[PDB]
Design a protein around this ligand. Sequence first.
Ligand SMILES: Nc1ncnc2c1ncn2[C@@H]1O[C@H](COP(=O)(O)OP(=O)(O)O)[C@@H](O)[C@H]1O
Ligand code: BEF
Ligand SMILES: [Mg+2]
Ligand SMILES: [Mg+2]
Ligand SMILES: [Zn+2]
Ligand SMILES: [Zn+2]
Lengths: 103, 340
Amino acid sequence: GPGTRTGRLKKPFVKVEDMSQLYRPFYLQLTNMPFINYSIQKPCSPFDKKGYCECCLQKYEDLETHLLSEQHRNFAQSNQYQVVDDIVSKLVFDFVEYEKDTP
Amino acid sequence: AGVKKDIEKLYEAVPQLSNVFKIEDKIGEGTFSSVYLATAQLQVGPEEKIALKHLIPTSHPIRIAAELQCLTVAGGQDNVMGVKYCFRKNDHVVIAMPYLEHESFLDILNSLSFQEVREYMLNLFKALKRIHQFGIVHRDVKPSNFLYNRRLKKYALVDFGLAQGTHDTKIELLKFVPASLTCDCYATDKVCSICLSRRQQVAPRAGTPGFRAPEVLTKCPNQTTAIDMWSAGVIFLSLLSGRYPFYKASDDLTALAQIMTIRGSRETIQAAKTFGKSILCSKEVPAQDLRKLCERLRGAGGWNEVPDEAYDLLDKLLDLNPASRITAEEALLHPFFKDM
Ligand SMILES: Nc1ncnc2c1ncn2[C@@H]1O[C@H](COP(=O)(O)OP(=O)(O)O)[C@@H](O)[C@H]1O
Ligand code: BEF
Ligand SMILES: [Mg+2]
Ligand SMILES: [Mg+2]
Ligand SMILES: [Zn+2]
Ligand SMILES: [Zn+2]
């Protein structure tokens, strides 16, 4: 059991394993497996902030905090967005632009 | 109030927007983006409604540009959304697209006619045929990413934020986006300290679990354009059965168990062998006849005359084997679409 990390899965279960046996298997255990319920009225199913910044290579616990950090602002102001700008250079701006409104 | 502040922050983040757009409302709030409805004036045309997609500023520039490049290169034709312009200030990128007013899928189901189902699926396959021709795997096909305007009979596949390229993709930027031991638990209900101690298998992020193909749910390393055709089949299954969401699951293996209750546990297990996955399911469930399944779920009376060709196409879209699963180009030639 849990103590030896050896034993058998309580049923019902689903078990998925890569055939190369290189990775930990994935398990699903539920009280009841899914059941197609035809009596539930349509359209109901018959079966009825933290993040990672790819720029800083850094986990963060709150987005707004991270966006204002020194390392993120440094990336944001860098030349790393040239790949975006090179696509924008091919697009045509065809909207009217207004002067800023002043009293 | 909450939307009013979001709009104010967007104007602050990209100040150029204040002199071009009247931002009216927030129409999308995802984990990795916010989409706004705005009004703009065209220099040599009428006033236009515009969708502004603000990408989360933690996205890498290459991922931002790859999404934009799908829209610029593959978009604008064959029911694939295009792009008018893109505004950037530092890490804030806003994609400006023509706004397509559209129906919610629950409203589609509420007034659905059979010919509307045919037209919707036909136009979805036109968009998938085009993006697959460019070597784009969308990875997030579902109704909220396929806009339908019933009055105009206009359609647009949107949202390439999770797209990946095929090996020979024509979207250049998509190219740029201890030891494990065997044990005797293989193909049994056993666990042991050997298999439990292996590292986790990883795969690219996909969309909503209820639209993921079995090879996505089981973390197959080779995921092809066929995964989008499975997702299209899930949309078709919702249209024919009247049930949405059809698969209601927040995790991959629950979705897989639901799929096995529809397509059969033994059938799913046999198909998974071909893409290198061993599946064991302690409770065997039979494959369902698709006509009977959809007719019983939708109600009787009156839609009892759906042709065999509809359920035959649904069977090919929901092929558990991703190699034999129908392609978008083949789907357009299917007898279901005779005369269209
Ligand atoms: N060009 C557009 N026209 C009309 N509505 C749009 C457009 N683009 C996006 N939307 C709306 O915004 C929502 C979110 O946009 P999407 O690009 O799907 O973002 P996400 O990647 O966060 O899912 C869509 O589901 C759709 O309702
Ligand atoms: F949520 Be989007 F459909 F990425
Ligand atoms: Mg989306
Ligand atoms: Mg998306
Ligand atoms: Zn960052
Ligand atoms: Zn083991």
